[PDB]
Amino acid sequence: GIFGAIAGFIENGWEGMVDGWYGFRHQNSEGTGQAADLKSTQAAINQINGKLNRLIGKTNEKFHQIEKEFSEVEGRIQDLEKYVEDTKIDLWSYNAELLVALENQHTIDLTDSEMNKLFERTKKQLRENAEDMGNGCFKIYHKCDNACIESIRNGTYDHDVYRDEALNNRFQI
Amino acid sequence: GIFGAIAGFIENGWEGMVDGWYGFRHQNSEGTGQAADLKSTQAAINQINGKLNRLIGKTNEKFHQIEKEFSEVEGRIQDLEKYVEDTKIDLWSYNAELLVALENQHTIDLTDSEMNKLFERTKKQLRENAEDMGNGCFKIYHKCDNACIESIRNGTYDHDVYRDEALNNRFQI
Amino acid sequence: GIFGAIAGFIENGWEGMVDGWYGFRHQNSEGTGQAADLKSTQAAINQINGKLNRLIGKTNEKFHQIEKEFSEVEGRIQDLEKYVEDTKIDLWSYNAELLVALENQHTIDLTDSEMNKLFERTKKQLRENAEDMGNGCFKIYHKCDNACIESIRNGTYDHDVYRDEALNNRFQI
Amino acid sequence: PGATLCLGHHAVPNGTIVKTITNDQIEVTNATELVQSSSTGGICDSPHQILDGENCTLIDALLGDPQCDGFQNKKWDLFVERSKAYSNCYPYDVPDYASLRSLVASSGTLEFNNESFNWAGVTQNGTSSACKRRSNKSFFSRLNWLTHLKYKYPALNVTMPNNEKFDKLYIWGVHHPVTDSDQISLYAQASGRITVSTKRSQQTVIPNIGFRPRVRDISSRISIYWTIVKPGDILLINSTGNLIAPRGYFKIRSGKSSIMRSDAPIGKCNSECITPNGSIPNDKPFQNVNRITYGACPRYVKQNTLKLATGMRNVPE
Amino acid sequence: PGATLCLGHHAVPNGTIVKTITNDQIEVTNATELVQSSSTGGICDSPHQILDGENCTLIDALLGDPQCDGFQNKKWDLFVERSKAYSNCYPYDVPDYASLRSLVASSGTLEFNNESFNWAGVTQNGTSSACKRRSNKSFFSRLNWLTHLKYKYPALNVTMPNNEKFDKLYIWGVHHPVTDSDQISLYAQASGRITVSTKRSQQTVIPNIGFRPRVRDISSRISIYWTIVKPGDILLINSTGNLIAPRGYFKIRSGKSSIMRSDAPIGKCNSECITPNGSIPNDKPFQNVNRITYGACPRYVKQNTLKLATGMRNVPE
Amino acid sequence: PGATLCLGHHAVPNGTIVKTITNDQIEVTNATELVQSSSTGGICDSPHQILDGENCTLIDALLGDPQCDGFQNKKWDLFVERSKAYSNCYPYDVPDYASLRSLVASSGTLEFNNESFNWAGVTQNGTSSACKRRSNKSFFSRLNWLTHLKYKYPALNVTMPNNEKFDKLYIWGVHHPVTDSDQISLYAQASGRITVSTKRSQQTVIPNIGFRPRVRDISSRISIYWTIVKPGDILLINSTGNLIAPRGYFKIRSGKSSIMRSDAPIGKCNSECITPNGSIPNDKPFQNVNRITYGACPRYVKQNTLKLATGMRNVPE
Ligand SMILES: *[C@@H]1O[C@H](CO)[C@@H](O[C@@H]2O[C@H](CO)[C@@H](O[C@@H]3O[C@H](CO[C@H]4O[C@H](CO)[C@@H](O)[C@H](O)[C@@H]4O)[C@@H](O)[C@H](O[C@H]4O[C@H](CO)[C@@H](O)[C@H](O)[C@@H]4O)[C@@H]3O)[C@H](O)[C@H]2NC(C)=O)[C@H](O)[C@H]1NC(C)=O
Ligand SMILES: *[C@@H]1O[C@H](CO)[C@@H](O[C@@H]2O[C@H](CO)[C@@H](O[C@@H]3O[C@H](CO[C@H]4O[C@H](CO)[C@@H](O)[C@H](O)[C@@H]4O)[C@@H](O)[C@H](O[C@H]4O[C@H](CO)[C@@H](O)[C@H](O)[C@@H]4O)[C@@H]3O)[C@H](O)[C@H]2NC(C)=O)[C@H](O)[C@H]1NC(C)=O
Ligand SMILES: *[C@@H]1O[C@H](CO)[C@@H](O[C@@H]2O[C@H](CO)[C@@H](O[C@@H]3O[C@H](CO[C@H]4O[C@H](CO)[C@@H](O)[C@H](O)[C@@H]4O)[C@@H](O)[C@H](O[C@H]4O[C@H](CO)[C@@H](O)[C@H](O)[C@@H]4O)[C@@H]3O)[C@H](O)[C@H]2NC(C)=O)[C@H](O)[C@H]1NC(C)=O
Ligand SMILES: CC(=O)N[C@@H]1[C@@H](O)[C@H](O[C@@H]2O[C@H](CO[C@]3(C(=O)O)C[C@H](O)[C@@H](NC(C)=O)[C@H]([C@H](O)[C@H](O)CO)O3)[C@H](O)[C@H](O)[C@H]2O)[C@@H](CO)O[C@H]1O
Ligand SMILES: CC(=O)N[C@@H]1[C@@H](O)[C@H](O[C@@H]2O[C@H](CO[C@]3(C(=O)O)C[C@H](O)[C@@H](NC(C)=O)[C@H]([C@H](O)[C@H](O)CO)O3)[C@H](O)[C@H](O)[C@H]2O)[C@@H](CO)O[C@H]1O
Ligand SMILES: CC(=O)N[C@@H]1[C@@H](O)[C@H](O[C@@H]2O[C@H](CO[C@]3(C(=O)O)C[C@H](O)[C@@H](NC(C)=O)[C@H]([C@H](O)[C@H](O)CO)O3)[C@H](O)[C@H](O)[C@H]2O)[C@@H](CO)O[C@H]1O
Ligand SMILES: *[C@@H]1O[C@H](CO)[C@@H](O[C@@H]2O[C@H](CO)[C@@H](O[C@@H]3O[C@H](CO)[C@@H](O)[C@H](O)[C@@H]3O)[C@H](O)[C@H]2NC(C)=O)[C@H](O)[C@H]1NC(C)=O
Ligand SMILES: *[C@@H]1O[C@H](CO)[C@@H](O[C@@H]2O[C@H](CO)[C@@H](O[C@@H]3O[C@H](CO)[C@@H](O)[C@H](O)[C@@H]3O)[C@H](O)[C@H]2NC(C)=O)[C@H](O)[C@H]1NC(C)=O
Ligand SMILES: *[C@@H]1O[C@H](CO)[C@@H](O[C@@H]2O[C@H](CO)[C@@H](O[C@@H]3O[C@H](CO)[C@@H](O)[C@H](O)[C@@H]3O)[C@H](O)[C@H]2NC(C)=O)[C@H](O)[C@H]1NC(C)=O
Ligand SMILES: *[C@@H]1O[C@H](CO)[C@@H](O[C@@H]2O[C@H](CO)[C@@H](O[C@@H]3O[C@H](CO)[C@@H](O)[C@H](O)[C@@H]3O)[C@H](O)[C@H]2NC(C)=O)[C@H](O)[C@H]1NC(C)=O
Ligand SMILES: *[C@@H]1O[C@H](CO)[C@@H](O[C@@H]2O[C@H](CO)[C@@H](O[C@@H]3O[C@H](CO)[C@@H](O)[C@H](O)[C@@H]3O)[C@H](O)[C@H]2NC(C)=O)[C@H](O)[C@H]1NC(C)=O
Ligand SMILES: *[C@@H]1O[C@H](CO)[C@@H](O[C@@H]2O[C@H](CO)[C@@H](O[C@@H]3O[C@H](CO)[C@@H](O)[C@H](O)[C@@H]3O)[C@H](O)[C@H]2NC(C)=O)[C@H](O)[C@H]1NC(C)=O
Ligand SMILES: *[C@@H]1O[C@H](CO)[C@@H](O)[C@H](O)[C@H]1NC(C)=O
């Protein structure tokens, strides 16, 4: 949420996008389409897998320790054994709580970041040939067929090819 | 500070804005005005209240524990009681220190974020009818009376109404 | 990485920039040049020095404690002494691990932020006289000699001086 | 002409300095304190059941020192022990004093039930001028000083079964006389020996004849011991002299009870968190009043202030 | 006409609620559980060497109670003590029981080596009806109840050097007879005294004649002691009665061994982490099954669930 | 034609790998080490007052073993005990040795004040061939071995008031003779008994006659005890034999003193943080040299390196 794309200027997600986490929907004179963006998808997944690699399958071996349940009343020594254990558990419980809150905040932010970065990369690529409609969509001011749309999605779009056409359409009266 | 609006491209805050945390000042041919933006204000407040809900009124009950002051010298057992307590206090003191440093960093950043998001939302809304002066102000290139300014503030501004007028003014010689 | 400039839209760093952390390279009709930006450089350094001031030269004095090595087998009391110490060391080892992971994530992000802020400040300054090529470079659409380039670098560039020239070049056919 | 529209944010003339990851001093518009650093100076009598020890340590209230009769059978959440408390009975010690004090404190009750021990062949109810009630010679209320009957002290071999559903706590003692002639005057034989046992435990204590420094004109001592007896078990006391006998048992409970050393006055007020300095508010997560706490309390830390920002960076005009 | 190109992100119909710094409930596309909250209910017999105590406490297996002969010389990573375990030999206590139990548990072996002590002038191998094997009178296998030989018990002054490269653990005891006539019937003199020493340590124990409650028809007791003897040191036992003698020594090792109280069945399966509830998977960093653990285990926490987001905020259509 | 203006950042040919939340290996331009992993190998003699025990344990320096006379009345911040240290006096033990060692270590002083105890009717200053000074028979300097005078040992009943403003630490002992004839040769009566008391505490110790393994040709032992006497209290020693008497008291102070086991040489240098391995720099927040520390030290952690990034991501050309 800190970048403002996911749950922000992007109104909602796409339940019908099942082959990636981020991507493109278009409309042009040949129809409509959806395609996943691999780079941004993999960037988010890789970061989340980084967190998982630090947290899953990483346990600590412990063997003989102290007793933690007692059948008889004893006083001072047992009071100390119980307090050491209660102290330890509360500190670990705090660590676990904070870890998940912090990590989750950061996951939401980094995924928002990856959406924003994809948006910015597309905005710059389009140069003077499109305008940001404010909702994650660009109005493209030239004929942009299926191959043209794919050139944007794959980073080969040459803005100079279409610039005269686009400027004429944008700055008309 | 990580977004660069508050204490960044926004030169300073407004001491005379007392009904919100973020908002708008304008000048047009009918005068000048200030108005709070509720959405951004409430977004920041809600997040900060989220932090407070986790930290205030949430104490842990403890009852019988260990002794922590001693009237006589005893050696080994007392050394252990004292070390357990000193250990515990230092760990909690560290947790408290880090908690406040981290939370404060994040509060400053999230409030900067909310300022930035409001700026970006206004920038996109204005389309080709205004230019960013670099200090959080837009020069609007058309007559924009009080109702026009309110349409921007309330999200009903129709850029197409003013676009011919604005382009003529922007791209004049 | 969360802003997307460093290791993102900026393809790589400059090994030949040794008098600052961020800056400018240009080409114009008098040649090419590089200059450090002091403000952004100092902003990043100051933040990192802030972290160092909290971590370096800040130790805790401790004196008489508990024994931590034992020449004889004893049972219950020694089990407790060993468990207290093992507990303490594991908690501190966790704190150290998390501290460095969190701090490093944040350092990478804040340095990316400072790069992004410099980019944004330059983008706004150029107004309608330049276009973002998508790789941290601006194409400036007017003659911009060495003094002109320095005016951009030092914040004195007056976009209005060059605007007619630039618009003519940008919106040509 | 057109218009100008500026985006911005508020500021205040009076901001507050906080610490961050990158700066030890940055001004924000508002902040809140996370460390409780003050107390009311009094211990609120609500909502925990407070028992003010006044002149009595818990152990003196247990044994039944003459200043402590008002404590019989009382319960507490928190027993408050005062620094002025002193003993006014026969001079005694408790090996492991700290453990007995702790286990009674944690049990939270002085509920006592008398039992009919058959002390066949001895004189009961011995008293001393070192332990007066109303200027009469007296003794600890919960203990029974046994002595010879017509210059005989026949061996004691006495049983008390626990046919209850709860545990019993027995307090008993050994008398260490000052001299060999005192040993004979009291017990009619040159030494004693005491063995107190159950099916699963045993304690034997040997009296040790000799001078200790006079305390309330007494150079002998009593040493106090205790024994817990489970349901279905049996207390067996076997002795030939020097037994300071139990009169019955204390109930032993489990729960949230404790003990605290404090000289803070008790007040009529309501506060969840108690420290030796007095009750403290518990809205904040941390406190630096005292490491010693009872109840729903903030966690003790070394810092005397920790300010949490509750607003943006303050950038005044 | 032109085209429209929209940037966006996925969503799912079925998201998962997680906690963050700023919100206790926010829906993300996916999450994973970090707290292990269930067990299989059984202790897997692999990969740790498990020793089920069955009817035997570790200490009864050590001393050689008649239900425990199958345990001789066995080793373990984890000794599992069952709540139903009970003693079926002469009634005994162990001052410091918890420490002896702990040090044997941690050593992880019952390896025992017999030694030829010269008990000159006494009767060896005493037995009792309270400690039967196959309806015969018997005794603890690792202990040797010495008594008079032809109404004499000459003083014992017996040496055993440790000429090994490892430490020796000796278990021995004192017999507390019920009566003075029992003392004489067994040992032929009115008291005993036992001093067990090395070059660097000494223990003396006094028998204490008296009645304790009958357990398996016995009102006397045995009290158990132990002594560790280093390489180059020498065990010296000096006694005039009441010695329950060692038959040799236990090996004392160091390593990863422990003991756990549990009634969970042992199963044929493989799991690294053991709790009293049974083995638990150890993929997750935290667990709320039991504070008591052995092996590579998640860390015990109070929370019963902690969901780590593994996807973006879920913003359904 | 126009111009091009590119924004960018530096890089280095030689970056450093660090760990983050999302990646275990990412290269940054620069980093700094947070774990101190090396020592100088020597203990710096500044700025803490170091006392090298050399051949003496603290307890031998306390009692006054003949190798330790140079230690009289010395103070320390850190007493350094060497693994080669050995005793060269009468064979002794200290029940609770660890506590006496600890409390003297923490006090930080061997300041001793002689007092004039009236040992009426006995022979003072007993010595032994097991505790030589300059080939003469001698004894612990701070203790006084009392024996019969003309075959009588009249009962001792001796008082020493504490009229100081500070606490007194008294060290005393009991002699356990090898045999009954040795008991009589030394003390002129078949047993001893020692009761040492104050107004608030008492200890009685029984000598235990018997053989222990010969150490420096001695099969008897001395057992060492201690007693703290508060201002306004009184030490009372009452005994009929076997007393190893105090010659006076030690001052007991409180402060920052401790003890450390180490074989590291002492050097002429200045370092705040001491470990058994030697002094270590204390610039870094963490260290992995030793869990045992004294002074202003980094915190012990398990990691041997933790690199803090001090620059941006390194993205080479
Ligand atoms: C700077 O930032 C802080 C933190 O956000 C603000 O402090 C909060 O201010 C609000 C408004 O005054 C407080 O709300 C009030 O809380 C009262 C109870 O508070 C006590 O108990 C809590 C713990 O439970 C403590 O944290 C706190 O310190 C107090 O001891 C309520 O009784 C109040 O009720 C009033 O309004 C309601 C409206 O429905 C009515 O029902 C009542 O009749 C009554 O009139 C109220 O809800 C809040 O407690 C404060 N939080 C903290 C942590 O202090 C500062 O206001 C802000 N400063 C500036 C200048 O902006
Ligand atoms: C929501 O997010 C989570 C976390 O990213 C996803 O969970 C992961 O899902 C993948 C794919 O199913 C899992 O990968 C598989 O792991 C198996 C082993 O897992 C066990 O052990 C680990 C600890 O070591 C535990 O964390 C885990 O819970 C299990 O108990 C492998 O055996 C699998 O192997 C299969 O594929 C490989 C491909 O090479 C083959 O070699 C095998 O033959 C086999 O077919 C596989 O690698 C991963 O374990 C899951 N992680 C966690 C933490 O649970 C969810 O999938 C995701 N949900 C949605 C809807 O997106
Ligand atoms: C990679 O990043 C690190 C961290 O920012 C840089 O390391 C710092 O480098 C500077 C410049 O050399 C160091 O500044 C110098 O510190 C000296 C004292 O340092 C010792 O003590 C501290 C603890 O107090 C330790 O952390 C440290 O390791 C040392 O043991 C001063 O004595 C120096 O003084 C010099 O300059 C001043 C200028 O006024 C003069 O007064 C003096 O005469 C003298 O000439 C100096 O201030 C700093 O200590 C380093 N920090 C750390 C943590 O190591 C690396 O330089 C950087 N590497 C690259 C390639 O950029
Ligand atoms: C049994 C008896 O009467 N013994 C006499 C000694 O007590 C007495 O010594 C003097 O005792 C003085 C105080 O006496 C009491 C007491 O504590 O108040 C009197 C009590 O009745 C007695 N209690 C019982 C149950 O018998 C009690 C007890 O003997 C002692 O406390 C045990 O130590 O003593 C006071 O302490 C004097 O300083 C002391 O000399 C001597 C001399 O008169 O005669 C004994 O017969
Ligand atoms: C030495 C001897 O034989 N003493 C006789 C007493 O034991 C006996 O008291 C009765 O003892 C009964 C059980 O007897 C044993 C036992 O525990 O099984 C018999 C054992 O052989 C004997 N062991 C040894 C090594 O001598 C053992 C031992 O004496 C006691 O356990 C020590 O306390 O006793 C049972 O407990 C009866 O309830 C009890 O009366 C008396 C009376 O017959 O005569 C003694 O000679
Ligand atoms: C009192 C006395 O002289 N007793 C004689 C025994 O000591 C002696 O046993 C032999 O003692 C040998 C060493 O003797 C000393 C010593 O430790 O150096 C001599 C000391 O003067 C004496 N100290 C005092 C204060 O009287 C000391 C003491 O008796 C013992 O240490 C107590 O255990 O003994 C050495 O240990 C021989 O191995 C041992 O046989 C016997 C036999 O000669 O005669 C006793 O009169
Ligand atoms: C063994 O040593 C102790 C300690 O020195 C002796 O105790 C002392 O005994 C005297 C004589 O009874 C006590 O004096 C009394 O003082 C009280 C209080 O003022 C007074 O009321 C009496 O009339 C008497 O004067 C003295 O208090 C006491 N001192 C201590 C410290 O307890 C004991 O007498 C010695 N025993 C033998 C047999 O010598
Ligand atoms: C444990 O309780 C038993 C049972 O009462 C005690 O044993 C008994 O002790 C008495 C007194 O010591 C014995 O009576 C005496 O006998 C001798 C010898 O004939 C005689 O000289 C005395 O005048 C007196 O009559 C009695 O025999 C004895 N009973 C048994 C069955 O052994 C024992 O003393 C108690 N132990 C303790 C530590 O208190
Ligand atoms: C000292 O007190 C103890 C405890 O009261 C006495 O122990 C009790 O002694 C009687 C008589 O031998 C025991 O009775 C026996 O019960 C068994 C089991 O049913 C039975 O097989 C025998 O025929 C006999 O009836 C009783 O169990 C025992 N009680 C306890 C709790 O141990 C002891 O006799 C007393 N000593 C003297 C000298 O009076
Ligand atoms: C420690 O071991 C020694 C060595 O055996 C024991 O000393 C010896 O004890 C016996 C029995 O008490 C003594 O014999 C007796 O002598 C008296 C007096 O002449 C006589 O009445 C008896 O009939 C018997 O003969 C022997 O003298 C004695 N030896 C020495 C060298 O002192 C000692 O008892 C053992 N200590 C313990 C606590 O077991
Ligand atoms: C009770 O048992 C102990 C231990 O077996 C006996 O102690 C041993 O006594 C002998 C005879 O005095 C000691 O021999 C001496 O060795 C020294 C050192 O080389 C030598 O200088 C003497 O001339 C003599 O040969 C032996 O060291 C000692 N052993 C131990 C382990 O302390 C003790 O004698 C026995 N007591 C009785 C009454 O039998
Ligand atoms: C505690 O200190 C007192 C005071 O000195 C000691 O009491 C005294 O002990 C002596 C020796 O045991 C007694 O003298 C003896 O009396 C008997 C019987 O008449 C006689 O056979 C002996 O020859 C000798 O004269 C003295 O009576 C006694 N005084 C008092 C007031 O009881 C006591 O021994 C000391 N306790 C300890 C544990 O050292
Ligand atoms: C927005 O502002 C305009 C101008 O005053 C007003 O006419 C309109 O009603 C407002 N719309 C909303 C939805 O508030």
Residue D105's domain is classified under what CATH number?
Answer: 3.90.209.20
Q: Tell me if D21 and C46 make a contact (CB, 8 A cut-off).
A: no
End-to-end CA distance of chain B: 38
Q: Quick check: F102 contacting B, CB < 8 Å?
A: yes
Question: How far D21 CA sits from the closest chain C CA (Å)?
Answer: 6
Contact F226, F172 (CB under 8 A): yes
- Region of B152 please: left (phi>0), alpha (psi -120 to 50) or beta: alpha
Rg (CA), chain E: 29
Contact B14, D8 (CB under 8 A): yes
Half-sphere exposure of residue A21, counting CA atoms within 13 Å on the CB side?
26
Residues in chain F: 317
Q: Concatenated DSSP letters for C43-94?
A: HHHHHHHHHHHHHSS-PEEE-S------SS---HHHHHHHHHHHHHHHHHHH
Residue D279 beta carbon below 6 angstroms from any ligand 8 atom: no
Going by the DSSP 8-state scheme, the letter that residue D121 receives in this structure is: T
**Sheet strand arrangement including D286-287:** D35-36, D286-287, D299-300
Q: Concatenated DSSP letters for F173-206?
A: EEEE-SSHHHHHHHHSSS---EEEE-SS-EEEE-
- Region of F189 please: left (phi>0), alpha (psi -120 to 50) or beta: beta
Q: How far apart are CA D240 and CA D237, in angstroms?
A: 10
As given in the structure block, the two tokens for residue F316 are: 């080479």
Nearest CA in chain E to A31: E3
Question: How far F25 CA sits from the closest chain C CA (Å)?
Answer: 11
Q: How far apart are CA E227 and CA E247, in angstroms?
A: 13
Q: How far apart are CA B21 and CA B40, in angstroms?
A: 8
Contact A75, A83 (CB under 8 A): no
- Cβ-based contacts of E101 with chain C (< 8 Å): 75
Q: How far apart are CA C156 and CA C150, in angstroms?
A: 8
Contact E84, E126 (CB under 8 A): no
Q: Tell me if F6 and C137 make a contact (CB, 8 A cut-off).
A: yes
As given in the structure block, the two tokens for residue C110 are: 């804040």
- Amino acid letter for position E292: I
Looking at chain E from residue 82 to 121, which residues have their Cβ under 8 Å from any Cβ of chain D? 93
Q: How far apart are CA D214 and CA F198, in angstroms?
A: 9
User: What is the E137 CA–ligand 5 centroid distance (Å)?
Assistant: 11
User: What is the E71 CA–ligand 5 centroid distance (Å)?
Assistant: 29
The per-type count for chain A, helices as H runs and strands as E runs, is 4, 5
Whether the bond into E47 is cis, omega within 30 of 0: yes
Q: How far apart are CA C158 and CA C170, in angstroms?
A: 18
- Report strand pairing: F43-46 vs F266-270: parallel
- Cβ-based contacts of C50 with chain D (< 8 Å): 20-24
Q: What is the dihedral of CA A10, A11, A14, A20, to 10 degrees?
A: 20
F92 forms beta bridges with F222
Reported as type and span, the H/E element at residue C122 is: helix C76-126
Size of interface C-E (CB pairs under 8 A): 21
Token pair 């000193």 is at which residue? B86
- Decide: helix, strand or coil at residue D288: coil
B69 CB burial (10 A radius; 0-12, 13-18, 19+) = exposed
Q: How far is CA E198 from CA E195, F93, F176, F212, in A?
A: 10, 11, 15, 7
CA–chain centroid gap for A28, Å, is: 28
- Report strand pairing: D78-81 vs D50-52: parallel
User: What is the A173 CA–ligand 1 centroid distance (Å)?
Assistant: 57
The parent domain of residue D221 ranges over 49-264
Q: How far apart are CA E168 and CA C155, in angstroms?
A: 84
CA–chain centroid gap for F119, Å, is: 31
Q: How far apart are CA E79 and CA E57, in angstroms?
A: 9
Neighbour tally for B27: CB within 10 Å: 18
- Decide: helix, strand or coil at residue F261: strand
Q: How far apart are CA A111 and CA A103, in angstroms?
A: 12
- Selected for mutation to probe chain F from E158, E202, E208, E230 (highest F CB count within 10 Å) is E202
At what angle are helices C76-126 and B76-126 packed, to 10 degrees?
20
Q: What are phi and psi of D134, to 5 degrees?
A: 45, 45
CA–chain centroid gap for A143, Å, is: 32
Going by the DSSP 8-state scheme, the letter that residue B60 receives in this structure is: E
Q: How far apart are CA E291 and CA A82, in angstroms?
A: 11
E155 CB burial (10 A radius; 0-12, 13-18, 19+) = middle
User: In b/e form, how buried is each residue of A69-105, taking b as 16+ CB within 10 angstroms?
Assistant: eeeebbbbbbbbbbbbbebbbbbbbbbbbbbbbbbbb
Alpha helix stretches (DSSP H) within chain F: 58-63, 97-107, 180-187
As given in the structure block, the two tokens for residue F231 are: 């201002």
Q: How far apart are CA F133 and CA E132, in angstroms?
A: 60
Q: Tell me if B65 and A79 make a contact (CB, 8 A cut-off).
A: yes
Q: How far apart are CA D271 and CA D50, in angstroms?
A: 12
- Cβ-based contacts of C136 with chain A (< 8 Å): none
Q: What are phi and psi of C28, to 5 degrees?
A: -150, -165
The closest of B159, F158, A72, A149 to E2, measured between CA atoms, is A149
- Amino acid letter for position C86: D
Question: How far A62 CA sits from the closest chain C CA (Å)?
Answer: 10
Q: Concatenated DSSP letters for D251-262?
A: E---SS-EEEE-
Residue E185 beta carbon below 6 angstroms from any ligand 8 atom: no
Q: How far apart are CA D247 and CA D115, in angstroms?
A: 6
Q: What are phi and psi of A32, to 5 degrees?
A: -135, 155
- Decide: helix, strand or coil at residue C148: helix
Q: How far apart are CA D128 and CA D138, in angstroms?
A: 5
Kindly list the partner chains of chain B, i.e. chains with 3 or more CB atom pairs below 8 Å.
Answer: A, C, D, E, F
Q: What are phi and psi of D105, to 5 degrees?
A: -55, -45
Angle at A66 between CA A62 and CA A67, to 5 degrees: 120
C1-173: which CATH number, 3.30.360.10, 1.10.10.10, 3.20.20.150, 3.90.20.10?
A: 3.90.20.10
Residue D157 beta carbon below 6 angstroms from any ligand 9 atom: yes
Q: What are phi and psi of C77, to 5 degrees?
A: -65, -40
Q: What are phi and psi of D275, to 5 degrees?
A: -130, 165
Q: Quick check: D191 contacting E, CB < 8 Å?
A: no
- Decide: helix, strand or coil at residue A14: strand
The closest of F101, F171, F168 to F143, measured between CA atoms, is F171
Contact F21, A50 (CB under 8 A): yes
Whether the bond into D47 is cis, omega within 30 of 0: yes
Contact E168, E162 (CB under 8 A): yes
Contact C104, F309 (CB under 8 A): yes
Q: How far apart are CA E170 and CA E187, in angstroms?
A: 23
Q: How far apart are CA E170 and CA B54, in angstroms?
A: 57
Q: How far apart are CA C75 and CA C82, in angstroms?
A: 11
Contacts of A49 (CB under 8 A, 6+ apart): none
Q: How far apart are CA B99 and CA C98, in angstroms?
A: 13
As given in the structure block, the two tokens for residue A125 are: 């690529």
User: In b/e form, how buried is each residue of C157-169, taking b as 16+ CB within 10 angstroms?
Assistant: bebeebbeebbeb
- Amino acid letter for position F225: Y
As given in the structure block, the two tokens for residue E286 are: 């935290």
Three-state SS string over chain E comes to CCEEEEEEEECCCCCEEECCCCCCCEEECCEEECEECCCCCCEEEECCCEEECCCCCHHHHHHCCHHHHHHCCCECCEEEECCCCCCCCCCEECCCHHHHHHHHHHHCECCEEECCCCCCCCECCCCEEEEEECCEEECCCCEEECECECCECCCEEEEEECCCCCCEEEEEEEEECCCHHHHHHHHCCCCCCEEEECCCCEEEECCCCCCCCCECCECCEEEEEEEEECCCCEEEEEECCCEEEECEEEECCCCCCEEEECCCCEEEEECCEEECCEEECCCCCEECCCCCCEEEECEECCCCCCEEECCCECCCC
- Amino acid letter for position B108: I
Whether the bond into F47 is cis, omega within 30 of 0: yes
Q: How far apart are CA F158 and CA C138, in angstroms?
A: 100
Q: How far apart are CA F156 and CA F166, in angstroms?
A: 26
Neighbour tally for F288: CB within 10 Å: 19
Q: How far apart are CA A114 and CA E316, in angstroms?
A: 19
As given in the structure block, the two tokens for residue E71 are: 């345990």
- Report strand pairing: C22-28 vs F3-9: antiparallel
Q: How far apart are CA E32 and CA A51, in angstroms?
A: 12
- Decide: helix, strand or coil at residue D136: strand
Neighbour tally for E317: CB within 10 Å: 10
Q: After which residues is chain E broken (C to N over 2.5 A)?
A: none
Q: How far apart are CA F188 and CA F242, in angstroms?
A: 10
Q: Where are the beta strands (DSSP E) in chain B?
A: 22-28, 31-36, 60-62, 130-132, 137-140
The closest of F162, F152, F125, F129 to F247, measured between CA atoms, is F125
Contacts of F119 (CB under 8 A, 6+ apart): F144, F146, F156, F158, F245
Q: How far apart are CA D213 and CA D220, in angstroms?
A: 8
Q: What are phi and psi of E240, to 5 degrees?
A: -120, 20
Q: How far apart are CA A40 and CA A21, in angstroms?
A: 8
- Cβ-based contacts of E311 with chain A (< 8 Å): 21, 48, 107, 111
User: What is the E155 CA–ligand 10 centroid distance (Å)?
Assistant: 6
**What sign has the CA pseudo-torsion D3, D4, D7, D8?**
negative
Q: How far apart are CA D85 and CA D87, in angstroms?
A: 7
Contact F198, F147 (CB under 8 A): no
Q: Whose CA is nearest to atom 19 of ligand 3?
A: F283
How was this structure determined? It was done by X-ray
Q: How far apart are CA E192 and CA F308, in angstroms?
A: 69
Nearest CA in chain C to F291: C68
Q: How far is CA A161 from CA A124, A151, C173, F4, in A?
A: 16, 12, 12, 21
Contacts of F40 (CB under 8 A, 6+ apart): F267, F269, F271, F278, F279, F280
Contact D124, D144 (CB under 8 A): yes
Locate the domains of chain C by residue range: 1-173
The closest of E297, E256, E306 to E276, measured between CA atoms, is E297
Identify which ligand lies nearest to the alpha carbon of D176: 4
User: What is the D214 CA–ligand 7 centroid distance (Å)?
Assistant: 7
User: In b/e form, how buried is each residue of E22-58, taking b as 16+ CB within 10 angstroms?
Assistant: bbeebbbbbbbebbbeebeebbbbeebebbbbebbbb
Question: At what resolution in Å was this solved?
Answer: 1.8
Q: Tell me if C3 and A91 make a contact (CB, 8 A cut-off).
A: no
At what angle are helices E97-107 and C76-126 packed, to 10 degrees?
60
- Cβ-based contacts of B28 with chain D (< 8 Å): 2-4
Q: How far is CA D121 from CA B87, D77, F32, in A?
A: 58, 42, 84
